[PDB]
Amino acid sequence: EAFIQMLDKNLDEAEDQFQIALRNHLIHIENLMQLQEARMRGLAEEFNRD
């Protein structure tokens, strides 16, 4: 019983770090989106100044 709980506590920890990895991945995609927005906004600004 303590192993199954550990099989779901070992699994609980594992799930926690998969959630951690997903949060990190979403953060990294968010930064990619932010800087791609920066690039597109710079392009638009330069084009409209021209």
Binding site: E1, F3, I4, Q5, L7, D8, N10, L11, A14, E15, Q17, F18, A21, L22, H25, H28, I29, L32, Q36, R39
Partner: protein, 97 residues
């Protein structure tokens, strides 16, 4: 927490009740065993040993499937690392293009 640990508590309580009843029945043997017949007593004791191991066999099955689930969860985490790496690779390529 809404259905996983709740079912864990359900099965925990059910198994505790099953253990209580099985201990009560083992005391029932220890008491009603004025049936001192050694041969039948031994035959029934091996029979109930088989009972116990068959009961446990469900636990071995569940634990083996869940070992396949835990090692496979580590494999899924590695697969997720590869998937996220390819995801960012394609994202960067398309964004710069």
């Amino acid at each position: 927490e809404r259905r996983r640990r709740e079912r864990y508590a359900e099965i925990q309580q059910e198994a505790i009740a099953s253990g209580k009843k099985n201990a009560a029945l083992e005391m029932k043997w220890a008491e009603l065993k004025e049936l001192d017949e050694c041969e039948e007593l031994n035959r029934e004791m091996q029979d109930q040993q088989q009972t116990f191991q068959q009961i446990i066999e469900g636990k071995e099955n569940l634990r083996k499937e869940f070992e396949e689930e835990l090692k496979r969860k580590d494999d899924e985490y590695v697969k997720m690392l590869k998937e996220q790496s390819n995801d960012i690779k394609d994202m960067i390529s398309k964004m710069r293009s």
